[PDB]
Amino acid sequence: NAMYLRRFYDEGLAHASYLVGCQETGEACVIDPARDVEPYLLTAKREGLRIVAALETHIHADFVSGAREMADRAGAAICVSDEGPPEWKSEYVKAYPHRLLKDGDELHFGNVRIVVMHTPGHTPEHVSYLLYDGKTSPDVPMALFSGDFVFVGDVGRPDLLERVAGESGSSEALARQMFRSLRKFEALPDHVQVLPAHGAGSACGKALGAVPSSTVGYEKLVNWALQHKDEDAFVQALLAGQPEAPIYFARMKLVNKVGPRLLAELGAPERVDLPPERVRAWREGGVVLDVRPADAFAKRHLAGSLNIPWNKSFVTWAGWLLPADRPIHLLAADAIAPDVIRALRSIGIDDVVDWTDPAAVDRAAPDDVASYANVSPDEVRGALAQQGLWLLDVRNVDEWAGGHLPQAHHIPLSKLAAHIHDVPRDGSVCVYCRTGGRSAIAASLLRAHGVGDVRNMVGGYEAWRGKGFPVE
Amino acid sequence: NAMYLRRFYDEGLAHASYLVGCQETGEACVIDPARDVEPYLLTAKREGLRIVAALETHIHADFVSGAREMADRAGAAICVSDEGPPEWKSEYVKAYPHRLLKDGDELHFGNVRIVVMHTPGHTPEHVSYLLYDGKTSPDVPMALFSGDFVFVGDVGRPDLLERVAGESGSSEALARQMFRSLRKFEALPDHVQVLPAHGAGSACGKALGAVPSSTVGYEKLVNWALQHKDEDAFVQALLAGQPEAPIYFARMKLVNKVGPRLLAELGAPERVDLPPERVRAWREGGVVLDVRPADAFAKRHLAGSLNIPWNKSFVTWAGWLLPADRPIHLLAADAIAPDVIRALRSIGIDDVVDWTDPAAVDRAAPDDVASYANVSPDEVRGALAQQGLWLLDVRNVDEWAGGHLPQAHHIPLSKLAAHIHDVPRDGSVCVYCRTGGRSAIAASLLRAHGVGDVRNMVGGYEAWRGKGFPVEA
Numbered sequence: 001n002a003m004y005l006r007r008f009y010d011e012g013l014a015h016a017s018y019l020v021g022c023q024e025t026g027e028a029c030v031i032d033p034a035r036d037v038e039p040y041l042l043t044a045k046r047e048g049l050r051i052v053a054a055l056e057t058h059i060h061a062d063f064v065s066g067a068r069e070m071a072d073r074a075g076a077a078i079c080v081s082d083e084g085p086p087e088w089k090s091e092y093v094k095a096y097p098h099r100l101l102k103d104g105d106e107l108h109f110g111n112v113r114i115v116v117m118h119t120p121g122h123t124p125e126h127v128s129y130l131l132y133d134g135k136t137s138p139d140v141p142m143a144l145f146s147g148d149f150v151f152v153g154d155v156g157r158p159d160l161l162e163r164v165a166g167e168s169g170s171s172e173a174l175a176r177q178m179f180r181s182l183r184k185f186e187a188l189p190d191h192v193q194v195l196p197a198h199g200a201g202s203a204c205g206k207a208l209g210a211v212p213s214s215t216v217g218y219e220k221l222v223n224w225a226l227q228h229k230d231e232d233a234f235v236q237a238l239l240a241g242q243p244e245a246p247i248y249f250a251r252m253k254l255v256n257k258v259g260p261r262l263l264a265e266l267g268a269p270e271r272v273d274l275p276p277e278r279v280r281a282w283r284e285g286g287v288v289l290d291v292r293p294a295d296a297f298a299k300r301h302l303a304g305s306l307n308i309p310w311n312k313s314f315v316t317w318a319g320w321l322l323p324a325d326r327p328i329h330l331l332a333a334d335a336i337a338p339d340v341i342r343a344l345r346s347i348g349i350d351d352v353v354d355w356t357d358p359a360a361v362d363r364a365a366p367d368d369v370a371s372y373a374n375v376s377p378d379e380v381r382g383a384l385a386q387q388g389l390w391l392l393d394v395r396n397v398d399e400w401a402g403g404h405l406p407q408a409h410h411i412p413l414s415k416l417a418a419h420i421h422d423v424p425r426d427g428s429v430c431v432y433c434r435t436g437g438r439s440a441i442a443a444s445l446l447r448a449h450g451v452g453d454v455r456n457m458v459g460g461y462e463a464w465r466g467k468g469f470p471v472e
Numbered sequence: 473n474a475m476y477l478r479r480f481y482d483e484g485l486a487h488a489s490y491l492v493g494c495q496e497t498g499e500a501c502v503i504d505p506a507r508d509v510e511p512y513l514l515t516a517k518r519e520g521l522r523i524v525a526a527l528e529t530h531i532h533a534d535f536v537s538g539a540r541e542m543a544d545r546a547g548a549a550i551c552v553s554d555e556g557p558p559e560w561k562s563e564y565v566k567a568y569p570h571r572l573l574k575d576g577d578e579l580h581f582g583n584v585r586i587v588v589m590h591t592p593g594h595t596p597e598h599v600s601y602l603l604y605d606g607k608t609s610p611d612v613p614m615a616l617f618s619g620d621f622v623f624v625g626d627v628g629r630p631d632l633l634e635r636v637a638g639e640s641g642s643s644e645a646l647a648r649q650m651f652r653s654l655r656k657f658e659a660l661p662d663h664v665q666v667l668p669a670h671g672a673g674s675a676c677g678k679a680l681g682a683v684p685s686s687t688v689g690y691e692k693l694v695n696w697a698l699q700h701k702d703e704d705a706f707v708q709a710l711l712a713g714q715p716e717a718p719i720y721f722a723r724m725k726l727v728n729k730v731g732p733r734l735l736a737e738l739g740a741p742e743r744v745d746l747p748p749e750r751v752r753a754w755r756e757g758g759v760v761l762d763v764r765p766a767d768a769f770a771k772r773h774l775a776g777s778l779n780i781p782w783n784k785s786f787v788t789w790a791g792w793l794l795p796a797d798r799p800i801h802l803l804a805a806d807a808i809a810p811d812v813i814r815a816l817r818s819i820g821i822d823d824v825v826d827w828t829d830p831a832a833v834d835r836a837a838p839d840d841v842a843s844y845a846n847v848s849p850d851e852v853r854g855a856l857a858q859q860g861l862w863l864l865d866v867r868n869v870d871e872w873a874g875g876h877l878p879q880a881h882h883i884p885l886s887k888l889a890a891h892i893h894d895v896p897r898d899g900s901v902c903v904y905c906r907t908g909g910r911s912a913i914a915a916s917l918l919r920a921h922g923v924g925d926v927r928n929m930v931g932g933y934e935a936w937r938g939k940g941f942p943v944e945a
């Protein structure tokens with residue numbers, strides 16, 4: 001069928017994007033491109049395609065859209081919904097070849113025929129793209145690029161506008177539009193593929209699938225959202241139990257609405273040599289991010305630096321904990337710095353001034369460096385009897401309810417920066433989570449606030465429960 | 473739904489394999505694994521899965537199955553059809569934990585429920601795997617791992633056994649079974665996903681899709697094989713216009729049936745220093761394979777070596793052109809050598825003794841080195857008026873039929889090895905294809921036969937036709 005389709009996935013943001021093309025003519029497009037557009041351009045070249053447009057399903061709350069980046073670097077047409085109210089219009093696209101899409105509009109790239117379906121719910125302007133193969137079967141639909149409207153096993157959350165943008169009563173209103181939009185979904189043929197914009201682990205929904213795609217037919221049978229017949233009842237279900245809204249989501253709606261800065265305009269973070277001499281002025285010059293494993297970070301790190309270890313969770317916590325309005329100095333191994341930078345850029349932390357291998361902490365000065373203690377539950381249990389410790393549980397509200405350490409204080413890591421003043425600087429603070437990931441990060445925050453004595457409980461609540469130690 | 477599914481794809485072989493798992497319990501399996509199982513084990517580890525089984529949809533003709541590899545390296549159960557006749561039985565699996573599957577059998581990996589469907593057509597034993605999610609919807613099917621039974625916009629060819637294995641009359645036989653098996657397929661709900669073992673570009677079908685999956689409902693509507701209501705007409709249609717059967721498919725059907733050798737048993741090819749002195753012993757010690765771009769190869773290469781440039785087509789031509797009964801010396805840049813070896817291993821070129829960077833060609837001795845000329849169409853056209861050249865066209869038959877250069881000789885590269893003797897050693901041989909890829913490979917093959925004066929036409933037939941030069945029908 002000379003039709004090309006490919007799915008690109010960002011494991012960190014849980015974000016799916018697509019490159020769709022006609023192999024006969026080569027015309028192609030990208031649906032919800034990441035900011036870093038290189039994988040698309042590179043794949044298109046190899047596959048003999050040319051990206052002529054970039055389609056956004058919605059104004060994204062969790063990552064910077066690569067629509068403009070494609071507009072610029074491949075000369076493509078910026079194709080975005082014009083179905084939102086005046087306050088959710090993308091007027092910047094007018095400085096480019098562009099399309100302001102309405103319900104029923106069609107986009108043609110060779111034999112690729114795409115039809116626009118206005119599907120409000122996640123957002124007011126949200127649209128999904130229905131795909132047909134014009135060569136073989138022009139009136140038979142093949143796939144729906146469902147955006148954050150319908151997921152595998154879930155539908156998009158309607159409450160982001162109320163939480164980050166401050167729009168009163170919009171969660172209810174959008175929840176209702178989600179219910180109406182779902183009726184348009186079930187009117188599609190069962191065979192149609194469902195290709196969403198996010199997957200397992202995204203904050204844009206409550207229980208997404210670790211299976212990359214589904215079908216209109218399957219979702220009608222199994223998706224919780226599609227079993228509801230009372231709208232009132234559905235609103236109820238939809239608003240309950242959604243994850244916390246990361247604070248940086250407000251920034252993304254703005255950036256993606258107004259037009260992100262072009263990666264060429266920021267330029268390359270330079271690789272600096274950092275001898276012990278230069279360290280303090282580097283520490284004083286901005287926020288120091290150290291992406292080493294916590295184990296190593298805990299023994300020796302630059303005082304006041306922040307540890308978000310390089311792994312699947314990086315971009316989540318970068319998002320929760322790093323500011324956009326401050327220059328970042330990065331400690332990162334040469335092999336991975338470029339990836340880390342990309343990840344920062346993917347969620348709009350643009351101002352990374354320079355970076356260097358974290359071996360620079362080795363020969364650094366005594367008044368430039370710091371440490372925290374990795375401790376075992378056995379140690380924590382001894383300090384328990386005479387109440388030597390001020391215990392901090394940084395797990396989620398729900399994990400805390402099932403049981404915590406005795407006399408433990410609860411601040412989840414997502415909220416720690418706000419309530420950090422509540423932690424006593426002169427006390428012996430001992431911090432834990434389920435297994436040791438979040439705590440490690442929390443520990444770096446605590447030190448940077450000024451809490452001198454900080455311990456991290458290796459193995460966490462599970463290691464403690466595991467040892468038969470008592471819980472309240 | 474705490475269910476994990478991931479598609480791995482070999483662009484070279486156009487082969488799709490899948491990792492399926494239960495995220496509650498961790499239990500996972502792999503469907504039609506490649507021989508290099510490292511990507512599956514790596515992904516499983518990152519995702520908190522443990523691979524417990526390896527499923528084969530059929531005895532594969534185009535690559536080496538990694539079932540055994542997975543059996544050895546993860547302690548997995550080898551799970552294979554027992555529905556074939558006595559001569560297509562994988563009796564080696566009995567030495568491992570294993571399941572000899574029949575139609576209607578089920579494999580349970582945590583909440584992952586898979587049901588075996590016998591679906592002969594591509595092969596007699598072929599089975600597809602139907603997947604249900606036992607956490608959410610135990611009686612609602614979700615996906616069909618169709619193997620080489622139903623592709624996106626096509627179905628498997630039924631003629632490999634007749635072509636590669638000498639099984640008279642079996643194409644027609646299996647063609648008919650394909651038609652029967654297709655009625656089971658269309659009995660499935662429209663919503664069920666179709667996830668095949670191959671994609672666009674495979675020799676295992678006529679016209680497979682560049683879209684990586686479909687649905688029972690979409691294929692019933694648009695797939696050509698599912699429009700035929702008459703069995704006789706379907707056999708006809710199915711058998712016509714199927715691509716060439718690469719000769720190495722015979723070897724794969726054997727290897728996968730009797731059980732392939734373990735990558736650990738072969739070991740790792742040594743990286744070797746090749747100073748100019750060691751070049752002659754290395755040339756006489758086996759088949760030298762040089763994977764540089766043709767351009768570079770053409771200026772200086774080790775006499776008698778073969779050029780298969782490293783790109784998407786490598787494995788296709790390796791399979792057509794290289795023997796598995798001779799040791800292979802490889803010239804490959806350090807950055808890519810391991811990938812090239814992996815590629816070779818995927819199609820059963822196992823005896824790769826050692827390798828070195830192709831800079832070893834630079835300071836080589838004159839009696840160890842050769843070249844061929846890259847020539848323009850303008851040059852070829854001047855040598856035409858006096859018939860100085862012996863033109864060789866290496867394109868497929870259908871391209872030839874569209875038009876070729878005047879007085880040209882037709883031997884497709886796939887067949888060039890057999891009919892090489894029909895090419896004259898003292899003639900000025902000038903070789904071409906559509907664009908110049910295939911012709912470059914041919915040129916090295918020619919020089920290795922002993923054709924002294926060999927030229928390659930840069931840009932091929934298209935550049936020639938482009939300049940308005942004369943053609944013949």
Ligand SMILES: [Zn+2]
Nearest residue numbers: 060061148204
């Ligand atoms: Zn979203």
Ligand SMILES: [Zn+2]
Nearest residue numbers: 532533620676
């Ligand atoms: Zn096959």
